[PDB]
């Protein structure tokens, strides 16, 4: 992702 | 009218009632030669060269449909 | 000959049919729905608005508007959709060809009639029209020329004393509690038990609860003490999703607001004391004939026990030797339509119609001149 | 006329083909490999990167990157190589000449669609493009206009309630467990028996073990006690080198994490309780039609017994008189592509495409305006 | 004499203190956490549950439950832990010795006051208790006997018209949007920019973002076009780990759902039109005094610009010559507690308490009889 | 709640 | 209505 999870 | 019929043959849970609704949405006041009969939602009028002819939507889709399963 | 159409614009239902029919051919809720969600599937066939039973069936997707409230037509484009649906889809009849008998509640705005005429002659091109007071028709429906008609709809309640075929227009009471304010009160009280009904589609579950399970107490305080002391009055119903809900003393409490409008914060007296106050405005020679022949009418009088509570509670007011009788036929829900059907078929009536020639000459104001 | 291309960028597989075909013409893993060893033999013919089945065949020599994870495209140069491979090598078609219907998981970042459009118009110069929510296509694929589609891929899981062709976008759940997190859990648990699978090439042995031998327990504790008490569930598989490995209670333990994400340390509830919690966000009038028509979709729902476990464990949640039905066609792995193939062939759709004229006028932001 | 305790069980915070204090002595989030991970280190000193600021501090390790949602107490064992923590740890007071004035939102289920009383007399053995409507206290807090209080918490929003000290219970609106549904919408929209906040501990980052950076637009469409056209509204915030996140037009978009609940798929009208629809249910003599004295209350009204947007958008509804005034004291977050503190200290009030003698005689039903 | 909503 | 009641 960009904040939460890794992608 | 033929193209929207072949579409309604393969859209899920298509029916003569939703076909008729699509005809009205697409042509009813956009085209001068297509008319809706005053007292029905299950018919439409085409202004042919000879005369106006009123077609009944009940059982177009059953007649319209061929698909032959190859395995048969 | 061509029959007249007979059409009754309740707040809650449309009843429509042909004169001389014994019951209405089309009854459906006078409701217009619009989609309130994004249209994801391509080629589904969108529709701008549903009407009547179509909007009932879809009502999970829709905001539901009622276009009449308190017998006043509050937006005309919807009401015109409802009439269009009535003539073309439900009756399947050309309005070009039939007189139309419309209907109205007494003492409501004069603008409502004018518009209701203008739309019949301009939009539907009806040959001839009439507008009739609701409470007058319930006497034709019940075989009487004398009585005080209590008529209660979805939107309005009114008393009209009629003696020997003369209305007494100074004695007309109109009271603005009806089935819809019972329904909003029922939602508010149901909230006490934890059930909350919020949306317009969800209101119309409560309407069905009210119809199925409500009844009128014959002593409000005694059944209050009973249901406070026993489970015996508690009864249960299934919501559409299968949740079961259980309803107790509250089920008599909502129709009690008809007899105690203070529950809704309505200052006015209940239907019993406005009925008695209507008879007390009539000339003393006729009270004996209006204490018999109290005619109930319209759906909000369909509650079990309302006739007994009325007779009991007027008999506490009236002098001890007047025979109080309440007359409540089981078809009283349709009685206004049945009486319209009788009225439109009389041959003496055929001079009364407002013909299109006269509307062309006079303009819509004629409806006040050529009508009650 | 020119057919549209229909191409579905799963996290795990590319499915691509032509609209109106009944099944996709090209399916290959969306994987990009690069050589990680010294090139000793002169004149072998080096290659900078392999894609898809080429990278599967060589995978002992290669580092394998997935360029999509959790449905987000995380580096574009690889994804652009994969699309290049799809158009030019697998379909062998000039993208100049065919509309392309792409596909996306709901509720993911808005930048992903902007870039995914920009690359189609600038790089591939496609005439016209569209982007469609995955779970919407599975209803076209399964002949329904109403249902709650549970769709689970390699990278993402989502529920999308659709009633009568309207989506209910407040009720859409997205949950981030999928086939790849099952695979990483499977490697972690397999380490218990001594088997250790470490590298990216060796992960994709574990994926094939998971596909062949895993299944979902219909009562997790009873089969745990069984396989703890008997060899009867123990089953065995050959690694590529001929080592045999043997797998017991553990083979049901990994797909159970779909129903108990706490095994992975995921706080959120499992797919069953997110399905029920999605239906509980819908209007109470439509729940009865969303309790039927639970549509399974995507490969991660292919486990034996998952439909029975879903029906069982939703039936424990829903009210006792709702008919819970789970609908799991055997082609549900391809159902998103099949539904895209149906959608792209409708004549009503041909107005919906984003044509290059419109992208030139508006720029890529148009994808939010002209699309779901 | 012994002071009363004054304790307000918001959905989001507990405020507690002693009557006659000007501000609450204990404010902490009404949240209960339980550990969700394996306890590896022996002898650390495990704890089954944290409450309030303890659960905030540990919240990376914990599942955080709110035991009140929408002003309804949804599991009692947690709420009893929260009260235990309030009396013994935060106030450090024996509940044996002080009357307790509790507080509740109007029109919620009656089983909530019964239990909330039963637990005070059986568990805490309080001498005497009372329960007071939240929106009534904000008038004591703002020096008025007339006004329409708009009060919005973490869980519920309600309007309560009060004129000259009489409540008008038919005109009470309750609306179920509040700070927590703003937070869930904020998480859903933030996902557009790529930030995803999933877990219950991580939700409570978003709550702090909402408090710090959100504001209400004075023209939603003009600022939408502005922030679509300029970086000037874009503002940035640090997550606990030091990642910076950047937030644009979205920061006004979430409190706009108060004025357009359709963003959440809520059918009902916004807080402005429910305020106006509340004044339209009051008698026409008092509307002029309810158009002044719109009192804001509770934390969800703390957004910058909400008073101006309310005044603007009611003034579009009310007749052109009514003086619309919005009254928004800067302490309005605590105003319900301040008004409870005033009410519990009046000498005329000391007859109103439910004494344990009366609860012993009557049982918990007494709370409906001896209270609003 | 008990019907119309989750609580 | 026009003034008293809402209709
Ligand atoms: N059996 C019944 N018991 C109680 N209320 C009813 C019953 N049938 C209808 N109603 C209520 O009465 C109203 C409909 O009455 P109706 O006479 O049709 O009104 P209108 O004449 O204004 O259309 C609605 O509020 C409906 O809920
Ligand atoms: N029969 C099966 N049983 C279990 N898992 C499967 C099966 N088929 C595919 N998978 C797994 O599901 C994922 C592929 O599912 P798919 O629907 O193709 O993902 P996507 O739609 O994102 O491409 C991979 O993790 C694959 O290992
Ligand atoms: N300055 C602020 N701006 C916007 N929202 C706030 C602010 N302070 C608190 N809130 C929100 O309002 C709610 C708390 O309000 P409060 O009045 O304490 O609720 P309750 O009275 O039910 O405990 C929470 O949702 C919190 O996020
Ligand atoms: Mg009627
Ligand atoms: Mg998929
Ligand atoms: Mg509050």
Q: Encoding tokens for residue E62?
A: 């914990």
Contact E64, E72 (CB under 8 A): no
Residue E233 · residue E246 · CB < 8 Å: no
* Ligand 3 atom with minimal separation from the E333 CA: 17
Q: Please check whether residue E322 is in contact with residue E311, taking contact to mean a CB–CB distance below 8 angstroms.
A: no
Report residue E3: phi and psi, to 5°.
Answer: -75, 155
Q: How far is F2 from chain E (nearest CA, A)?
A: 9
Q: Which residue's entry shows tokens 């039609």?
A: D289
Q: What count of other Cβ atoms lies within 10 Å of the Cβ of residue C336?
A: 29
User: How many A from CA of D111 to the centre of ligand 5?
Assistant: 20
Query: Which residue do the tokens 């959440």 mark?
Result: E264
Q: Are C112 and C82 in contact (CB under 8 A)?
A: no
Q: Does C198 touch chain D (CB under 8 A)?
A: no
Residues in chain B with CB shorter than 8 Å from the CB of C46 are 25
Token pair belonging to C150: 């209590």
SS3 C272: helix
Alpha-helical segments (H) within chain E: 53-57, 76-84, 111-118, 134-141, 179-190, 200-213, 220-227, 250-253, 271-279, 287-291, 306-315, 335-345, 356-362, 366-369
> D145 vs D102, D357, E149, CA distance in Å?
21, 32, 45
Expressed in angstroms and rounded, the spacing between residue D152 Cα and the centre of ligand 5 is 6
* H helix or E strand, kind and range, residue E48: none
* Complete DSSP assignment for C9-64: E-SSEEEEEETT-SS-SEEEE--EEEE-S-B-STTS---S-EETHHHHHTTTSEEE
Burial (CB < 10 A; 0-12, 13-18, 19+), residue C63, is middle
Chain D nearest-CA distance from A5, in A, is 9
Report helix angle C110-119 to C76-85, nearest 10.
50
Burial string for E228-257 (b: 16+ CB within 10 Å, else e) reads eeeeebeeeeebeeeeebebbbbbbbbbbb
Structure token pair of residue E167: 């409540």
Which residues in chain A are closer than 8 Å to D70, comparing Cβ atoms?
1, 5, 7
Torsion E168-E169-E171-E174 (CA) sign = positive
- Closest residue on chain E to C189 (Cα): E107
Q: How far apart are the C-alpha atoms of A3 and E246, rounded to whole Å?
A: 11
Answer yes or no: is the C-beta of E303 below 6 A from any ligand 3 atom.
yes
- Report the residue from E194, E198, E202 with minimal CB separation from A2: E194
Q: Are E274 and E193 in contact (CB under 8 A)?
A: no
Ligand 3 pocket member E70 (CB < 6 A):
no
Question: Longest Cα pair distance anywhere in chain E, in angstroms?
Answer: 73
CA distance A3 to chain D (A): 11
Q: Which two tokens stand for residue E205?
A: 């980052």
**DSSP assignment of D318-370:** S-TTS---EE--TTTTTHHHHHHHHHHH-SGGGGTSEEHHHHHHH-TTHHHHT
Kindly state the tokens that stand for C339.
């009486």
Distance, in Å, from the CA atom of G2 to the CA atom of D371, rounded to the nearest integer, reads: 44
Tell me, yes or no, if F1 comes closer than 8 A to chain C by beta carbon: yes
C-alpha of C372 from chain center: 20
Chain E CB contacts of D110 under 8 Å are 192-193
CA dist., res. D205 & res. C30, Å (int): 65
C-alpha angle D151-D152-D153 in degrees, rounded to nearest 5: 125
Chain A contact for D75 (CB, 8 A cutoff): no
Tokens encoding E174: 């309750």
**DSSP-assigned states of every residue in D130-186:** EEEEHHHHHHHHTT-SSEEEEEE-SS-EEEEEEETTEE-GGG-EEE---HHHHHHHH
How many A from CA of E258 to the centre of ligand 5? 36
Distance CA D161, CA D140 (A): 14
Backbone phi, then psi, for D34, in 5-degree steps? -130, 145
DSSP structural state of residue E139? H
**How far is it, in rounded angstroms, from Cα D248 to Cα D231?**
8
Nearest Cα neighbor of E313 from E180, E198, E217, E181 is E217
Q: In terms of Cα–Cα distance, which of E302, E304, E203 is closest to E252?
A: E304
Beta pairing class for D100-104 and D5-9: parallel
| Separation CA D19–CA D27 (nearest Å) | 15
**Contacts D268 to E, Cβ<8 Å:** 198-199
Contact F1, C193 (CB under 8 A): no
SS3 of residue E205 by DSSP: helix
Distance of CA D56 to the CA centre of its chain: 19
Q: Give one DSSP letter per residue of C132-149, joined into a string.
A: EEHHHHHHHHTT-SSEEE
Residues D168, C350: Cα–Cα separation, whole Å: 54
Torsion of CA C276, C280, C286, C291, to 10 degrees: 20
Bridge partner list, E173: E159
Secondary structure (3-state) at D56: helix
Domains and CATH numbers, chain D: 2-28+70-135+335-368 (3.30.420.40), 29-69 (2.30.36.70), 136-182+272-334 (3.30.420.40), 183-271 (3.90.640.10)
Rg (CA), chain F: 4
Please report the atom of ligand 1 found closest to the CA of residue C14: 23
Q: What is the DSSP string of D29-50?
A: E--EEEE-S---STTS---S-E
Which phi and psi angles does E179 have, rounded to 5°?
-55, -30
Can you give the resolution of this entry in Å? 3.0
- Minimum distance, in Å, between the CA of residue G2 and any CA atom of chain C: 9
Q: Give CA separation, E312 vs D221, E296, E298, in Å.
A: 61, 15, 20
Structure tokens at D211: 């596909």
Q: Which atom of ligand 1 is nearest to the CA of C208?
A: 27
Question: How do strand E100-104 and strand E147-152 relate by DSSP bridges?
Answer: unpaired
- Residue D195, C-beta contacts closer than 8 angstroms, at least 6 positions apart: D245
Contact list in D for residue E199 (CB cut-off 8 A) is 267-268
Backbone angles phi, psi at C340, to 5 degrees: -65, -35
Residues of chain C with Cβ-Cβ distance to B11 below 8 Å are 43
**Are C356 and C127 a contacting pair, CB within 8 Å?**
yes
The DSSP code for C207 is H
- Distance (Å, whole) CA C144 – CA C90: 31
Q: Identify the three-state secondary structure at position E79.
A: helix
F1–E69 C-beta distance less than 8 A: no
Could you tell me if A1 lies within 8 Å of chain E, comparing CB atoms?
A: yes
Rounded to an integer, what distance in angstroms lies between the CA atom of residue B35 and that of residue E165?
A: 66
CB E25 within 8 A of CB E121: no
Tell whether C262 lies on the interface with E, counting CB pairs under 8 A. Answer: no
Tell me if residue C148 falls in helix, strand or coil.
strand
- From C300, C334, C338, C339, the mutation candidate for ligand 1 (largest count of ligand atoms within 8 A of CB) is C300
C264 touches chain E (CB under 8 A): yes
Inter-chain CB proximity C88 and B38 less than 8 Å:
yes
Rounded CA separation E314/E325 (Å):
10
Residue of A nearest to D66 (CA): A7
The answer to whether E156 and E178 have CB atoms below 8 angstroms apart is: yes
C63 in reach of chain E (CB within 8 A)? yes
- Does residue C107 come out as left (phi exceeding 0), alpha (psi in the -120 to 50 range) or beta? left
């Amino acid at each position: 992702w960009x904040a939460x999870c890794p992608a | 009218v033929l193209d929207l019929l072949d579409e309604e043959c393969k859209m899920p849970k298509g029916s003569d009632d939703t076909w008729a609704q699509k005809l009205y949405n697409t042509h009813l006041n956009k085209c001068a030669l297509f008319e809706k009969p005053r007292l029905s939602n299950k018919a439409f009028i085409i202004k042919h060269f000879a005369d106006k002819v009123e077609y009944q939507c009940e059982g177009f889709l059953e007649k319209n449909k061929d698909t032959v399963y190859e395995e048969q | 000959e061509t029959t007249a159409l007979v059409c009754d614009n309740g707040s809650g239902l449309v009843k429509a049919g042909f004169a001389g029919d014994d019951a209405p051919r089309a009854v459906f809720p006078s409701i217009v729905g619009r989609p309130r969600h994004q249209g994801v599937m391509v080629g589904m066939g969108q529709k701008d608005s549903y009407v009547g039973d179509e909007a009932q069936s879809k009502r999970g997707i829709l905001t539901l508007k009622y276009p009449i409230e308190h017998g006043i037509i509050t937006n005309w484009d919807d009401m015109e959709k409802i009439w269009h649906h009535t003539f073309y889809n439900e009756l399947r009849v050309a309005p070009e060809e039939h007189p139309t008998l419309l209907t109205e509640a007494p003492l409501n705005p004069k603008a409502n009639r004018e518009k209701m005429t203008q739309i019949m002659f301009e939009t539907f091109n009806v040959p001839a029209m009439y507008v009739a007071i609701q409470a007058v028709l319930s006497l034709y429906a019940s075989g009487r020329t004398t009585g005080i008609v209590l008529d209660s709809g979805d939107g309005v309640t009114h008393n009209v004393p009629i003696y020997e075929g003369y209305a007494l227009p100074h004695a007309i009471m109109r009271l603005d509690l009806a089935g819809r304010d019972l329904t909003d009160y029922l939602m508010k009280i149901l909230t006490e038990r934890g059930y909350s009904f919020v949306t317009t589609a969800e209101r119309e579950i409560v309407r069905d609860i009210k119809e199925k399970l409500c009844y009128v107490a014959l002593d409000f305080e005694n059944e209050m003490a009973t249901a406070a002391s026993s489970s015996s009055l508690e009864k249960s119903y299934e919501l559409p999703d299968g949740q079961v809900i259980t309803i107790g003393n509250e089920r008599f409490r909502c129709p009690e607001t008809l007899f105690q409008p203070s529950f809704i914060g309505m200052e006015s007296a209940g239907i019993h004391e406005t009925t008695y106050n209507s008879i007390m405005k009539c000339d003393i020679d006729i009270r004996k004939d209006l204490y018999a022949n109290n005619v109930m009418s319209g759906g909000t009088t369909m509650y079990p026990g309302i006739a007994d509570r009325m007779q009991k509670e007027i008999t506490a007011l009236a002098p001890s030797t007047m025979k109080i009788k309440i007359i409540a036929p089981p078809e009283r829900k349709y009685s206004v339509w049945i009486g319209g059907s009788i009225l439109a078929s009389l041959s003496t009536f055929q001079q009364m119609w407002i013909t299109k020639q006269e509307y062309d000459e006079a303009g819509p104001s004629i409806v006040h001149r050529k009508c009650f």
